Design an enzyme around this catalytic site. Sequence first.
Site, PDB file in Angstrom:
ATOM      1  N   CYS A  48       0.821  -1.214   0.000  1.00 47.21           N
ATOM      2  CA  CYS A  48       0.000   0.000   0.000  1.00 47.21           C
ATOM      3  C   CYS A  48       0.856   1.264   0.000  1.00 47.21           C
ATOM      4  O   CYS A  48       1.492   1.615   1.018  1.00 47.21           O
ATOM      5  CB  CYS A  48      -1.008   0.026   1.148  1.00 47.21           C
ATOM      6  SG  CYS A  48      -2.146   1.441   0.878  1.00 47.21           S
ATOM      7  N   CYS A  91      -0.779   4.185   2.060  1.00 45.56           N
ATOM      8  CA  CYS A  91      -0.584   4.061   3.512  1.00 45.56           C
ATOM      9  C   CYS A  91       0.816   4.487   3.921  1.00 45.56           C
ATOM     10  O   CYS A  91       0.981   5.149   4.916  1.00 45.56           O
ATOM     11  CB  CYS A  91      -0.798   2.622   4.036  1.00 45.56           C
ATOM     12  SG  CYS A  91      -2.434   1.924   3.803  1.00 45.56           S
ATOM     13  N   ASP A  92       1.826   4.057   3.169  1.00 41.18           N
ATOM     14  CA  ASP A  92       3.225   4.103   3.642  1.00 41.18           C
ATOM     15  C   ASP A  92       4.098   5.127   2.959  1.00 41.18           C
ATOM     16  O   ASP A  92       5.215   5.355   3.413  1.00 41.18           O
ATOM     17  CB  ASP A  92       3.874   2.730   3.536  1.00 41.18           C
ATOM     18  CG  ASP A  92       3.225   1.710   4.463  1.00 41.18           C
ATOM     19  OD1 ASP A  92       2.712   2.120   5.529  1.00 41.18           O
ATOM     20  OD2 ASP A  92       3.218   0.498   4.130  1.00 41.18           O
TER      21      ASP A  92
END
Lengths: 314, 314
Positions: free
Chosen positions: B137, B140-141
């Site tokens: 992801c 997300c990161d």
Amino acid sequence: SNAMLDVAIIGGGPAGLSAGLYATRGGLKNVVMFEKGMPGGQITSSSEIENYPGVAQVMDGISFMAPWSEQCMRFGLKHEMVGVEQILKNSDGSFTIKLEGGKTELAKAVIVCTGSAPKKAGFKGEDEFFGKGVSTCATCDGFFYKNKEVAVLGGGDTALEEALYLANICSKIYLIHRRDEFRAAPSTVEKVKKNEKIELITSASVDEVYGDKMGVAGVKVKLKDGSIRDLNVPGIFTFVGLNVRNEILKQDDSKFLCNMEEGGQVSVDLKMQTSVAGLFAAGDLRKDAPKQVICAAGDGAVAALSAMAYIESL
Amino acid sequence: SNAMLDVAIIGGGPAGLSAGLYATRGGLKNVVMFEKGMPGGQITSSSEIENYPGVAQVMDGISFMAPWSEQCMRFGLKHEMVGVEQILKNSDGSFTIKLEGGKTELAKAVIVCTGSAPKKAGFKGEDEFFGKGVSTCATCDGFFYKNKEVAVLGGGDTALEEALYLANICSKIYLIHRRDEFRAAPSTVEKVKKNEKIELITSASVDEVYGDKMGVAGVKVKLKDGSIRDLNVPGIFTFVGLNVRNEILKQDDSKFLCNMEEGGQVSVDLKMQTSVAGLFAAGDLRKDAPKQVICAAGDGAVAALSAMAYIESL
Ligand SMILES: Cc1cc2nc3c(=O)[nH]c(=O)nc-3n(C[C@H](O)[C@H](O)[C@H](O)COP(=O)(O)OP(=O)(O)OC[C@H]3O[C@@H](n4cnc5c(N)ncnc54)[C@H](O)[C@@H]3O)c2cc1C
Ligand SMILES: Cc1cc2nc3c(=O)[nH]c(=O)nc-3n(C[C@H](O)[C@H](O)[C@H](O)COP(=O)(O)OP(=O)(O)OC[C@H]3O[C@@H](n4cnc5c(N)ncnc54)[C@H](O)[C@@H]3O)c2cc1C
């Protein structure tokens, strides 16, 4: 036109538009969507869509469909404003598309997306008065019946919706349906039962619409007990369902180009593949169609994905 | 919960949400959508969707999916935030839904909508470093890798898109793919070839990600000629496809509840009917799924329409 098309898409409703979006974004360079009018198809004649997931704003069919043209044409999709008369399968595996006025197109693949058209209700005078007081489009013709009474025939989501829409315009509506209960969303039914301007005539049907050259003068309704009620009204709108437009698949020997269903739908599998290589179908025309905008869009994307893979295969 | 559910919908991505919208608008009163997190599913982790017909504004997955909850819940749909462990078919024709923590639900019909999850790429250290520099992801990161170099593995639309997104955040990206040409939309490929911050490593694969407890320290890439290139990078993101989540259909004798496909998909017909009465499937989990948001929505609506007709039939 000079070169053979990669895909010919026949019809520009949600299914066509969506197929055109997918086929061109995906990399195909010659993709024409043949739509006889402006794109949008059936829903452009609805007064309200609200159930298209991801579009949270309730609006009329024309406003709903308006952004689609720009979006679905960003990667080179062409709109030819012409009617199509016939699909043919060439001995060589290509397709011939016959157009109105004697013109012809060639194509590696074809996605037939032609939608559906309003069923006849089957009553005396229906055909004779069509376009002179009998109508199947309330957004087109509502305005002519401002502060007047009209009849609406049908008992599905469409009939009720267009009855709600006509209730803001006409002085009164008679909603007529052959069963005791409507086959429609409960929130729509509740709005209809609550609207002071709509009178339900249930377990009833239309015997005859009558009038003269000047237009409809009235409707005879047959009631549950077999008696006739004379509605003195200048308009009736019918919403008793639609038939698939499958004329263009009919060959000259009167046979169909691919396998058809009992009710006129084109047989397909999950990938919208018909029995004929390179011919796909999407939307209301395909087998078991649910008859919804979101579904005709899903199908169109599937078809384009299958038309791409097929094209890469040759 | 006190009474048996009309429908249990297993998963809340586009397909679940869309099934919940259709089933409740349609008139069913007890409809629970079991989604372990917040609804939206896979696409909420995309940085860009633009091909969902009827939504003309290009945006990230979270913004795209945000309006859906309100829209799909207008007619009484319930969201239970719980994971489901198992579907069972009762001798009586009803379904038993097994939940995490030993809880149980009953239902007349079930629509399984559980989506897909990221495939393993298959390289040394993949599993050992997952969540310490290996990720699936980018939204997300990404933030953790601002002004840093990372690797992205994959050659589909998803890999390229997330590489474009990571190019606004990281100082540099190495895009690695096992073939000479990307299997992806040409407009996305052109943006990738034009971005000064993304270096293509084609006909290549990942030999090993290495590092220690503190995290990934680097990636070994095997090049077309068989040599190794050492990428000194603290992060690699993988986008090499997804598998269907079909765990919940597995019975205790290790057999599947209904007919499955070779690749783990649930077998269905056009109406999303599985081989077991009252069990439907939609979205990526069903046979021949195209793996698109618009299609998972179409399917969910079909399933709900078939779950309604089935319910009316008993
Ligand atoms: C009044 C009404 C209300 C509705 N409300 C809803 C709703 O609220 N929610 C919902 O999901 N669905 C609703 N629907 C259903 C939805 O509109 C249809 O399911 C959907 O539009 C079918 O899409 P399609 O793309 O398969 O075909 P169509 O919508 O019919 O698109 C086909 C297009 O193809 C063109 N065409 C056909 N033949 C040819 C040819 N020979 N050559 C060139 N062009 C051709 C036509 O002119 C037409 O524009 C409604 C339908 C109606 C009639
Ligand atoms: C990075 C990325 C980019 C993408 N970009 C595009 C794009 O640009 N255009 C496009 O069309 N498609 C795109 N897709 C594909 C699209 O996201 C999927 O096709 C679609 O979301 C599938 O929808 P679904 O509803 O079938 O399943 P999902 O999206 O996975 O929804 C399933 C949900 O079910 C829940 N769930 C699963 N099992 C259980 C259980 N046991 N109990 C409770 N809850 C459960 C999960 O938590 C998940 O939230 C992309 C996918 C990814 C990964």
